[PDB]
């Protein structure tokens, strides 16, 4: 019983952690899109030729 309650607590922490990450990544996609088009389009194309 002791082990079952301790692992239940860490399971709730890791389950919410996965959803929190997914929502943070969704925000990052929008954030990136504005600066990525002007500055990053030339930097990405030139960097890929060096890679």
């Amino acid at each position: 019983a002791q082990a079952e309650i301790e692992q239940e607590l860490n399971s709730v922490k890791d389950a919410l952690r996965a959803q929190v990450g997914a929502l943070a990544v969704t925000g990052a996609e929008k954030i990136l899109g504005a600066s990525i088009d002007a500055n990053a389009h030339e930097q990405l194309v030139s960097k890929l030729a060096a890679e």
Partner: peptide
């Protein structure tokens, strides 16, 4: 609080 520290590694 743990979600912000595991993100530092990402």
């Amino acid at each position: 609080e743990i979600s912000e520290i595991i993100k530092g590694r990402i």
